[PDB]
């Protein structure tokens, strides 16, 4: 997959990514350059995204989360909701090809009292 739990987001160079950088609020958004990098954020009740995912030059799916401790609300590091499920989005099948067998479900989620509507691919 290769799964891999990842480190604090930090700043990624404005010349290493191929494609868009998705961040998960848990809602899938697309972040950009200056005012695509600095993905610094704490958990999204307070802060912008739980984690992100992109793709470097070498064709490797790069991820970043926040410091690891619904349990996703407490500590989630991006697209993966459970070990068996991740948040669906356009570049999901690029960024996560091993998951093409996953069944997709529509779900609801509350973060800091605001409702998010997401699609999830599970197992």
């Amino acid at each position, epitope marked *: 997959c290769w799964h891999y739990p990842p480190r604090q987001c930090g700043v990624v160079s404005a010349k290493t990514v191929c494609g868009p950088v998705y961040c998960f609020t848990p809602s899938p958004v697309v972040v950009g350059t200056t005012d695509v990098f600095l993905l610094n954020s704490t958990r999204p009740p307070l802060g912008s995204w739980f984690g992100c995912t992109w793709m470097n030059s070498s064709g490797y799916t790069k991820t970043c989360g926040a410091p690891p401790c619904t349990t996703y609300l407490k500590c989630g590091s991006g697209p993966w909701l459970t070990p068996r499920c991740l948040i669906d989005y356009p570049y999901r099948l690029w960024h996560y090809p091993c998951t093409v067998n996953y069944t997709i*479900f*529509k*779900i*609801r989620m*509350y973060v800091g009292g605001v*409702e*998010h*509507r997401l*699609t999830a691919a599970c197992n």
Partner: antibody
Amino acid sequence: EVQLQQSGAELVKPGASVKLSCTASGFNIKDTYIHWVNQRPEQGLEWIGRIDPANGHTQYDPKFQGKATITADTSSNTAYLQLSSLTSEDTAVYYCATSDYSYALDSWGQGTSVTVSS
Amino acid sequence: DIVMTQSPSSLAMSVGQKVTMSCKSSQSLLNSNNQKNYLAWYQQKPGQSPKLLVYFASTRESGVPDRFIGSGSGTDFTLTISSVQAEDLADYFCQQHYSTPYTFGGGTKLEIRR
């Protein structure tokens, strides 16, 4: 916040057809099923059908097959209910609602009042 | 189609009293793979649109008072309001959200005795 804004009241002659709209905000309708339900005056609730805006795929109560058609335009976050060959018996309030995978109707528009009359 | 039947057709209780209403489905609403019952309860205040109270027979919707309590399983379901408030006057509907077409009960009209 999940919100459903429905179009305005309709007068429509018998035999005629009408198209209602349901516009969502604060979320993307792709991630929901949009349902339509009707409520005849002083009466109960009745499911018409639903659509998967990610799919285009729709499901109906067979009794409404031929008279109702649900569609959705994801670029404007709007779903539609087209009704055709209306009669006085279709005079009703038409609601749209969101569900997740569960099909329980978790959020509802304000409703659209449709009068069928000559 | 699954037939939903609600009881009673109307209710009148004074504020503070416990309210009880029931819902019978023509067959089980129990998802075996899930162990959940796909029954929902809705509240419709006069002139307003229906609003979801309970789903999966007992899971209470976010933002709904704790006095609202759904229970039961199999083919027998109840919604209870532990101590009723003046603002709770409404029609209440059960719905099986198990299989198409997702059918509703005929509704219980709740009024306030004063």
